[PDB]
Amino acid sequence: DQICIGYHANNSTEQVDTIMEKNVTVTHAQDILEKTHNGKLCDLNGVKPLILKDCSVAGWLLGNPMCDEFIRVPEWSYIVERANPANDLCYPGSLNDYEELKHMLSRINHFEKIQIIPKSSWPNHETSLGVSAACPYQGAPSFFRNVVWLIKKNDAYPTIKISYNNTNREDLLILWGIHHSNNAEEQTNLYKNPITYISVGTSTLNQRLAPKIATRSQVNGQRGRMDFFWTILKPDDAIHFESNGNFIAPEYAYKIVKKGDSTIMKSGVEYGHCNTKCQTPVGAINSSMPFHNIHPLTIGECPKYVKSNKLVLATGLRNSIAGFIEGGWQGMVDGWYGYHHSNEQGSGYAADKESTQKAIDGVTNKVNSIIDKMNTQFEAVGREFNNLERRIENLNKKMEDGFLDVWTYNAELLVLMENERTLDFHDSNVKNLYDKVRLQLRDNAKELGNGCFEFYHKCDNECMESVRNGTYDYPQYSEEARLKRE
Amino acid sequence: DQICIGYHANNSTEQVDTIMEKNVTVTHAQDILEKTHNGKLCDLNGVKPLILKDCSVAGWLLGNPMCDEFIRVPEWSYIVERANPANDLCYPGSLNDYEELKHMLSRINHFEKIQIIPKSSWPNHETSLGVSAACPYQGAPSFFRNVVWLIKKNDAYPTIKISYNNTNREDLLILWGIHHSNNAEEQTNLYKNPITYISVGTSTLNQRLAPKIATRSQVNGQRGRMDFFWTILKPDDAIHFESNGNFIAPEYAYKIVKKGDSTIMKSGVEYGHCNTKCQTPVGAINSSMPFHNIHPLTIGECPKYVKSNKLVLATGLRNSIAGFIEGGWQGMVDGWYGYHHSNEQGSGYAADKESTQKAIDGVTNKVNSIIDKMNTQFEAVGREFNNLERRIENLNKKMEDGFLDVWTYNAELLVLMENERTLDFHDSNVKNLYDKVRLQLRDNAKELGNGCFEFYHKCDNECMESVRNGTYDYPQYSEEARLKRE
Amino acid sequence: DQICIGYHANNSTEQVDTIMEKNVTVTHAQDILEKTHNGKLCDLNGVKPLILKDCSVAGWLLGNPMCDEFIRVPEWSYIVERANPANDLCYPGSLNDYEELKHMLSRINHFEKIQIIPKSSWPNHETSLGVSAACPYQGAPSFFRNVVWLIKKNDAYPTIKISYNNTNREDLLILWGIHHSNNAEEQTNLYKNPITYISVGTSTLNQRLAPKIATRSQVNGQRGRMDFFWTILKPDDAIHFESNGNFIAPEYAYKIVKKGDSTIMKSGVEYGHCNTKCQTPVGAINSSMPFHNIHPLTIGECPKYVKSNKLVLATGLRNSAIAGFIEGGWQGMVDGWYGYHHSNEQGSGYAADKESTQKAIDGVTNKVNSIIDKMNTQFEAVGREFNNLERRIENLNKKMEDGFLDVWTYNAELLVLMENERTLDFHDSNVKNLYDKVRLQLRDNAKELGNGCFEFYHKCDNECMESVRNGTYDYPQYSEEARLKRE
């Protein structure tokens, strides 16, 4: 008859790393790194995003003749734009403060197009000959649909003086442009005025522009250029226009209410009719883990980006008639620590739930604390800088690289320390049990040194159960042990 | 006759959290988070700040009639400004590079106002008619006090040519402006010349401006605009002015010496006549703790900002005829570890000075190291970007959020781990005392298993003090114990 | 007659600090902080940097007469420039977008100067009178060598129209400028046209300029000013020029290929003819340590910067014939970390245990190597390129750098203290385990003196002592002898 103390073992082949040792096999393990995604675009908090397909923000706003598909978007959460849009500006030119406009238009609560100046408001000017071959429509010359190009009528260009007095209860977005001619003859043929000017004024805007006649290289078969501008009109403000040539008047305006911020995503994947909380250009994430390695650029409440490919926390035991010194028993299934009994009455395994429950609770609490002690907040990441702003881009790159390195180091070191701590805790528990069974039986038996005790006397099944319970009668078998000795 | 080992216990109720269990009860604890402030504005290192009350920087500099009295305060550390100043730019207009001037005027030493161009220097121009109803003073039209508005005299406006040596030994700040008319008739009424220009030139400045005549919405009953500019004059440089209309000439200049930098605070709290080191918009904070959660915006040597509400370190034992594994001893005052003694003379308590002193020193060193290993530097945090610089503001917000998350996570994890270590550090010391006593005792007594030893022989107070001291003579009582063993 | 346990001890005086104790003497220690440099400038990955000596970037590009060092370096890794260059611009003026051009003129794969407009292309204009005393050369007036200052000829200034196709297969860098006069008389004497203009146009450029005539201060004896501009020409684009006065036509153009990105170093150290990997204004760093405290500004893959002065990691034993419970200063053992000292009638000796020593050294080495190796290092170029009117972004950058420095310093110090504390107990645990293993094998044949030794009742000789070290002991063989010895 003998009593031994051992620990649970199984056929698991999972491996973890510690500070001192590498490739240690454990019975159970858990991963805290996210590495999967659905590979589709999904709604952000129930708000459908805006997809511009092959168009661009400038082309969509100005009304490119090949980009009239999008006319109904009451609201959106973020904008998805392809990396190299095809139809951006049919007529060569530029838009002032393009990046700021895109950043402002990222997230819009309400959007509606209205007409502010009917085409009938120009009795003394021609409004039908302003077409170009650089903006074809069904094989015919056309122009932008949201603006009107005015030319001379009856060989005369009377001065223009009109004003608009805002009556809606929301802000308005208004766009206008100026055209640069090629030579004096073309300027005379188009406007009859050798020298022209444009004046725009509001409560806060004071602008004056003049044409720049010169020679330029051909773009899309056209040597002219067009420059556009934009502004925001207050609910009770008014805007005044005045020009005598080279003026592109506005026709439609947008009603905008903004109560948030976002950025623009460059991706080519398709919509998927799904709801998510975190979005990446390659897919969506639906994980509660504190770390991930999918993609740097993310929108929304997302885990943190790290370089490591594996972060495994050890939660089980060290995998491998004897005792705890040799190895772990495979015959026991219930519990982590227990006793293997053996006598003439029978043999079997008995577990100790008192310490197993405490160990399980401790490990679970450690894992839960590590997972849940992390704070996350809404963030938007993107590239919003042009050619002549490289210094700020480099600063942002330094930002992201430093944060990535810090997080990677912290996570790796924390995992490495915690694995060893858990292993040492398990060893401490098993030795605590071994000394708990000790110092109670006294000299009635002898310790073979292999984790087992050989009773000199005879201990019944009830006696062994009482030993497990922690209540043992030493004087009951003291004389039997004494006469048994030698 | 028995000796038992135990530890201190009291009526405390503080609770601390570990990595494995939540709010175990401990006897003593220390907080390392600061959550209190005096709620007043105080001097920074003995330098009084600048309080503008209901004015703005531009209004204070230009001399708004209903805003400023005189300069005062030749030096200051930071500027306190209300969220929405009332008196600012009575005449509608704008100031060029407002944000840069605001940032540069944060911390200034030896700020003094001097007069450079007396009003007697304009004998051929009118100087007593440049007043407007948009800037009333005691019910009468007035204008800015630091600049002069020039009008035509005797239906004429001769060209102006003036230069200024800077004979002072410090840098000089000069401001001037240009006025935009409303129509040709008004321009002729104010100035005889129909076309005007302004030329300003220094060793590093080359500027030429022209007025812009157009129709604008009326603000404060005025449709005109005034744009102002500023520059820094070197100690031995000169500035040349040349104009023939629409010119606002300077009259006063400021002598400025700068060494350092700070930021502008938006707050409404009052002055309190105190000297602090860290300042927040809601009050002033002084402490040695490494963390705080008062306000994100701070100026000076302030602790780090975290989101947590509680951060408590454990510096004591676990609270709850006895023994080690029963609990604590309420009656055992004056010590952490010690011996409970009971002979035929009587019973009482005794403490082990050495182990308690080592434990106290270790805990104190741990706490002091955690507190003092923090590096603090002077910093100024504030919002200094306009409406057309949203991207940089987003970048700054990303900076602040990332740093806050990193600090919060690291602090929480460190607190949990150190609490875990410190909570069970003392158990090893108590175990060491126990088996030291057992090693000296050997088999002269019997272990009851609850933490005491039942003496077979008689041990008087001298023998008991010898046992505590570490001088036990086995052969002296061995024969008596052998006879009593049966 | 007795057997004892102990550990190695020596004559080192290294000191380390733990969380609970300070100034603890240890047998062996290792530092993980780099504090040395060669004090020289070296090549970066085999690419020699560009050293401009006393000439600034603008003067080198425009062709300042006092910068006659026309040495050709087709490819450079970074630019070394003095804090206050002397020869920058002989004629007072400014260069548009100077900072962006300087940033773009970092590491360049290919660079060559070619001629695009010969002087013979101006038959109706004077090209020999464009000299000034502000740009002396051998005691004679001169001008920039890369541009031409056009003056009126035969009291006439015909309008200029010219275009240039880029027939090369690489990007082109072109510079031009405009001159500001002082008064009407000077303008008439120089160009004969009271009103002038300049027009420049490409596929993406549309610029128009007009001279500004005013009175300015005297700098270098000249009251005039000169403003220069630059642009990048695509491999199949063209640029058109048109002006009627105050025009400074380009003569030479730079043919450039750009792949990477770098920054500019401000230092005065000399060249060293070395090939390093990390660069610093005060020298070069060659180490694999994760931390350093040399200089905040670095270029390349460099360790992290901290404000600490000492970072020592404990890897040895607690430095100071009975031991194991009392002072373990067993100076006799010089062949291991843990072992036994034996003594009987035959003799004595300081034996050692190989298994425990191997386990301990492997564990400590693994810890040190893991801490050193788990560093992610990437190429980062750190500099300070911001003008006088951009102080807010500079303050933002300074705040970022300070925050990162504080985080790294605090984390490193706390980690070092915690790891020293953790390491200074594994040896104690091993010694206690060895002492326990020595026990429960002799049982009652020996008396545990408590001092860290066992005294056998029976007679055990060298073979029996070697056996008990080996872990094989015959208790019944000496059981009766221990019985008869027990009184």
Ligand SMILES: CC(=O)N[C@@H]1[C@@H](O)[C@H](O[C@@H]2O[C@H](CO[C@]3(C(=O)O)C[C@H](O)[C@@H](NC(C)=O)[C@H]([C@H](O)[C@H](O)CO)O3)[C@H](O)[C@H](O)[C@H]2O)[C@@H](CO)O[C@H]1O
């Ligand atoms: C008055 C006229 O028609 N003159 C003819 C020249 O324009 C023409 O030169 C060719 O012009 C081509 C493009 O001309 C258009 C266009 O962009 O399609 C024609 C449009 O009617 C005109 N629109 C308006 C509202 O005036 C438009 C406009 O003038 C410019 O876009 C101004 O920026 O120009 C094309 O570019 C050819 O490459 C160019 O040679 C010559 C020769 O074809 O004939 C003239 O009769």
Ligand SMILES: CC(=O)N[C@@H]1[C@@H](O)[C@H](O[C@@H]2O[C@H](CO[C@]3(C(=O)O)C[C@H](O)[C@@H](NC(C)=O)[C@H]([C@H](O)[C@H](O)CO)O3)[C@H](O)[C@H](O)[C@H]2O)[C@@H](CO)O[C@H]1O
């Ligand atoms: C010089 C004068 O008396 N001009 C008369 C016009 O002012 C007047 O038009 C009315 O002008 C009102 C405001 O005019 C002031 C003002 O701001 O109070 C009058 C000031 O004397 C004048 N100051 C100077 C130095 O010239 C000032 C100035 O002209 C403008 O501010 C320039 O920006 O204007 C108010 O705006 C009324 O709405 C407007 O009708 C006309 C018609 O009565 O008579 C003029 O003689």
Ligand SMILES: CC(=O)N[C@@H]1[C@@H](O)[C@H](O[C@@H]2O[C@H](CO[C@]3(C(=O)O)C[C@H](O)[C@@H](NC(C)=O)[C@H]([C@H](O)[C@H](O)CO)O3)[C@H](O)[C@H](O)[C@H]2O)[C@@H](CO)O[C@H]1O
């Ligand atoms: C052409 C000439 O000699 N003109 C004389 C004026 O220059 C002179 O005024 C004095 O000018 C001095 C410098 O004049 C130079 C120079 O910078 O050395 C003379 C150069 O020939 C001339 N170069 C060209 C290509 O025209 C150059 C140029 O005019 C200016 O740099 C334009 O910015 O100027 C010096 O500044 C003296 O302080 C100044 O008084 C007057 C009176 O002496 O006589 C003119 O003949």
Ligand SMILES: *[C@@H]1O[C@H](CO)[C@@H](O[C@@H]2O[C@H](CO)[C@@H](O)[C@H](O)[C@H]2NC(C)=O)[C@H](O)[C@H]1NC(C)=O
């Ligand atoms: C730690 O103590 C807190 C007491 O503050 C316990 O938290 C409370 O839990 C009850 C129900 O369990 C809630 O109704 C209270 O609102 C909680 N208080 C706070 C301040 O959150 C907590 O349960 C204790 N820890 C554990 C493991 O039970």
Ligand SMILES: *[C@@H]1O[C@H](CO)[C@@H](O[C@@H]2O[C@H](CO)[C@@H](O)[C@H](O)[C@H]2NC(C)=O)[C@H](O)[C@H]1NC(C)=O
């Ligand atoms: C402003 O005044 C100072 C003081 O008179 C001028 O500096 C002097 O200039 C003359 C001739 O230029 C020299 O001979 C003196 O030696 C200078 N004195 C000092 C103390 O430097 C200065 O030139 C004047 N400013 C301008 C633009 O002329």
Ligand SMILES: *[C@@H]1O[C@H](CO)[C@@H](O)[C@H](O)[C@H]1NC(C)=O
């Ligand atoms: C640890 O295990 C992995 C997986 O098999 C193996 O690639 C690696 O080489 C192992 N480490 C060592 C030191 O052998």
Ligand SMILES: *[C@@H]1O[C@H](CO)[C@@H](O)[C@H](O)[C@H]1NC(C)=O
């Ligand atoms: C815009 O219209 C409202 C409607 O009466 C008017 O009160 C307001 O003054 C108008 N705006 C301006 C600038 O006059």
Ligand SMILES: *[C@@H]1O[C@H](CO)[C@@H](O)[C@H](O)[C@H]1NC(C)=O
């Ligand atoms: C996310 O995953 C959980 C399970 O982890 C699942 O129940 C849920 O449907 C998924 N989607 C959302 C939107 O929560």
Ligand SMILES: *[C@@H]1O[C@H](CO)[C@@H](O)[C@H](O)[C@H]1NC(C)=O
């Ligand atoms: C705890 O005991 C101390 C010791 O006298 C006493 O001063 C204190 O008031 C007690 N606290 C409570 C809550 O009873």
Ligand SMILES: *[C@@H]1O[C@H](CO)[C@@H](O)[C@H](O)[C@H]1NC(C)=O
């Ligand atoms: C901090 O302020 C408190 C006021 O509540 C004061 O008692 C204390 O002395 C101050 N500490 C220092 C170092 O000034």
Ligand SMILES: *[C@@H]1O[C@H](CO)[C@@H](O)[C@H](O)[C@H]1NC(C)=O
């Ligand atoms: C310390 O001991 C080593 C070992 O022999 C010896 O080489 C060295 O000289 C000694 N140093 C001192 C200062 O005693």
Ligand SMILES: *[C@@H]1O[C@H](CO)[C@@H](O)[C@H](O)[C@H]1NC(C)=O
């Ligand atoms: C630790 O040693 C250093 C160097 O000898 C000394 O400067 C310092 O004061 C010592 N610390 C203590 C607490 O004695």
Ligand SMILES: *[C@@H]1O[C@H](CO)[C@@H](O)[C@H](O)[C@H]1NC(C)=O
């Ligand atoms: C440059 O030459 C090529 C050669 O065919 C020609 O196609 C191109 O049009 C030329 N550049 C311009 C601006 O015309």
Ligand SMILES: *[C@@H]1O[C@H](CO)[C@@H](O)[C@H](O)[C@H]1NC(C)=O
């Ligand atoms: C850098 O230092 C290592 C270690 O001493 C050495 O092997 C290597 O040759 C050094 N490299 C250079 C370029 O000096």
